[PDB]
Design a protein around this ligand. Structure first.
Ligand SMILES: CC[C@H]1C(=O)Nc2ccc(F)cc2N1C(=O)OC(C)C
Lengths: 536, 409
């Protein structure tokens, strides 16, 4: 019946075909369906069956249109490779003299189904006299909404396009969903001609496409962007305008803005997000504060501006430049020619238990690198706000293996630097503070203090504290009460980690206070010693 | 003719994702695969096959051409079970490794098992669906390939073995390790002789052991000096219970300046002496257990230096050592680490005959996006990413080094 070879399909091991009862349907709904299945049978899409067929699926009606529910069949159907969920990004596309888009929607139903598996798709047309035997059928082609259809259809398209592609090297085809997107750098007449050749080639296999009178118009709306065959733009983003905002409204908005932060610089949600505190219900009406009214306002302005883009030229350099927009926050733009970006983005404030700015820069760099490999199969040359000396100093001695691909320095404030650097050896002439902190773990009552070789001492009692905290507070006190250079001895295990990693940011607000003190000193030497020893 | 290989009971085939590759690597893999399919070694597949094994391309030891490397680790683990280790290979003045992974394409793979060898050449920007294949012939890097061909491999080895019995020949996956005491030239001339036999169808184990730890020795010691010493020794007592810091700590009482000089008690004096002696030899009673996994932990020491320990039980090392980066690896922590893992896995194989599981002081993402760029072996070991404990590093930093070094006028 059909030219294309079928793909052998199976039900997950052990499981069996669907057995769902057919809902009762009104008389006009049954008629509509009775007619659609007379035509579908005629066209060859389905076959009249009804004897030894146990399986069944519910048919529906939404001129009427039928809808079969294969959720159950899908639950019983084997697994397939996967119909890739990773779709291309405009930044990776190439500028083409011509691009045509062929909707191959009905091509779905033009691909045969493993006859061996067709029994499973059986469904039934109800009756008025609920009693009478229903009209039974089954599918001969890939059912709309069935599990295997996307995968099998595309595999089929792949084998059918093989020859054409071989005979036409200068032509790029992209298949996705039920859309063939054909592009090239041939003269428009020659391109139009080759499209027609492709259409008749597909048609030779039973696949239909709309004529030149029906094919879709470039610019094409494709997942947020507007594609022109010579550049791309961003479909303008529209922010509502209401007198009453509910939590849903505010979360939806914050959602939209956050997506825009990527392409647009300066979008902010801090004040809008504040509206979400202690909210008791989704439908709750929160009034915008002045600042949220304002913030909302400036964002509307920013989004008015048109953000255009450019395509990828493989004969040109790929460059990535990075900015630290605030602590933990990073912005980047990848381009080829100065000021003509291919892509831009930012990474949400990276927050953790303890790290440093240089380490974070390093991570931003690798996220970019993974994204670039995917988009361009190449790695950008990097222009980073950090001096070579700074990198060489930090990396060369950090405890963890780290790297940054070829890069060059770009002096664009604020630069990424080392906020402090613990001394390598004890400091001659600096007061030496022996610190200690202890707390009852259960009563959460403790004491933190020190004694210095110069005779300075202090102790403070704390309540609702932990042991870890008294120890760290001991260190905090020493830093507060000492001169510009200080030596500090501690048996705290967490200080041992500070010595190794020398973090400039942390979760612990106490550690953060210590860090601020550490940064303030001219010289600090931190020394760890085993606890409960004959030391101190 | 094919032996019916099967999966370990209750196990399914590998469904591992293909990581993204550079453009260069993709072009290369496509060629390589077009050729293999011509030659009937692999065949394109349908979507009804849901299994996958990552694949990638390398350029091992000098080569203006790419080699295809497949990561069958997962598949190997799910594959059923089926020669022991030449205890003396470890004792040969010199070993040389050979890539005999080509022998395998000379044999067909059980029909019903090929589905599990499915792999996918990715496409740039997803502008195209991956190119899927599966093997028809025994694939390089799979654990069954060296077994199912043992028969034919041994067969081709006898005449050479039974010709030199002053040479040990050991096999592991795609490789063959051979060691002899003959001088350098002879060794190689004999190696080539072996390869010639093969065509018809640089290690020196005299260096490896557990390394000696050496405590500082000093004119005068400061409070800080003793403090550091004391913390290292206290940690080390988890290995040698006879190590003690009682006398040293008594010198650490009172609040003296970190830089003040302290005179060592005649007792503390002996204590340091007794300690130095205990550390003169590897701890007693450590033996390899063939039934337990072998562990390999690495620490980054800085300035291109790396220390490692191989053990099965905590603090009971089978071997320990140092690794200094090679030439032109100066700016690449990832290159250095990679190189070290290959060198450590190789010794691991030359000694116990299996690969160890590595504990790596690197962030997972850093390792995953760049390790293949510098890999050169046919095998791939297991690994986990860890945080190095400050003291573990400070301790092994202490191992003794050559007086001058290893001469080579
Ligand atoms: C086939 C040509 C291919 C390409 O290289 N550049 C462009 C440029 C403009 C377009 F509108 C489409 C595409 N192309 C493409 O595959 O786009 C799909 C993801 C929509």
């Amino acid at each position: 019946i059909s030219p294309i070879e079928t793909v052998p399909v199976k039900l997950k091991p052990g499981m069996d075909g669907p057995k769902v009862k057919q809902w009762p349907l009104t008389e006009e709904k049954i008629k509509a369906l009775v007619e659609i299945c007379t035509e579908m049978e005629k066209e060859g899409k389905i076959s009249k069956i009804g004897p030894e067929n146990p399986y069944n699926t519910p048919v529906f009606a939404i001129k009427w249109r039928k809808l079969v529910d294969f959720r159950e069949l899908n639950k019983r159907t084997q697994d397939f490779w996967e119909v890739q969920l990773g779709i291309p990004h405009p930044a990776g596309l190439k500028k083409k003299k011509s691009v045509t888009v062929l909707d191959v929607g009905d091509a779905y139903f033009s691909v045969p189904l493993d006859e061996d598996f067709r029994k499973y798709t059986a469904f039934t047309i109800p009756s008025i006299n609920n009693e009478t035997p229903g009209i039974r059928y089954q599918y001969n082609v890939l059912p709309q909404g069935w599990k295997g259809s996307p995968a099998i259809f595309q595999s089929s398209m792949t084998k059918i396009l093989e020859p054409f592609r071989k005979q036409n090297p200068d032509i790029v085809i992209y298949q996705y969903m039920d859309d063939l997107c054909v592009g090239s750098d041939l003269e428009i007449g020659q391109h139009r001609t080759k499209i027609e050749e492709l259409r008749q080639h597909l048609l030779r296999w039973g696949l239909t496409t709309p004529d030149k009178k029906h094919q879709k118009e470039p610019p094409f709306l494709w997942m947020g962007y507007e594609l022109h065959p010579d550049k791309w733009t961003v479909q303008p983003i529209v922010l509502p305008e209401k007198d009453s905002w509910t939590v849903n409204d505010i979360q939806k908005l914050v959602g939209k803005l956050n997506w825009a932060s990527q392409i647009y610089p300066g979008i902010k949600v801090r004040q809008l997000c504040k509206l979400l505190r202690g909210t008791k219900a989704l439908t709750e009406v929160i009034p915008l504060t002045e600042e949220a009214e304002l913030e909302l306002a400036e964002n509307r302005e920013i989004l008015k501006e048109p953000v255009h883009g450019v395509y990828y030229d493989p004969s040109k350099d790929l460059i990535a430049e990075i900015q630290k927009q605030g602590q933990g926050q990073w912005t980047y733009q990848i381009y080829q020619e100065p000021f003509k970006n291919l892509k831009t983005g930012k990474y949400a404030r990276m927050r953790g238990a303890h790290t440093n700015d240089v380490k974070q820069l390093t991570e931003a760099v690798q996220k970019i690198t993974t994204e670039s490999i995917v988009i361009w199969g190449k790695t950008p040359k990097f222009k980073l706000p950090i001096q070579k000396e700074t990198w060489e100093t930090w990396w060369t001695e950090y405890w963890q293996a780290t790297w940054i691909p070829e890069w060059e320095f770009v002096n664009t404030p604020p630069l990424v630097k080392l906020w402090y650097q613990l001394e390598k050896e004890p400091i001659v002439g600096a007061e030496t503070f022996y610190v200690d902190g202890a707390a009852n773990r259960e009563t959460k009552l403790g004491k933190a203090g020190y004694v210095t070789n110069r005779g300075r001492q202090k102790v403070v009692t704390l309540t609702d504290t932990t042991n870890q905290k008294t120890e760290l507070q001991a260190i905090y006190l020493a830093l507060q009460d000492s001169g510009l250079e200080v030596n500090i001895v501690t048996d705290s295990q967490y200080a041992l980690g500070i010595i190794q990693a020398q973090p400039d940011q942390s979760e612990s607000e106490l550690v953060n206070q210590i860090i601020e003190q550490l940064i303030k000193k001219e010289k600090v030497y931190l020394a760890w010693v085993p606890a409960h020893k004959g030391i101190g």
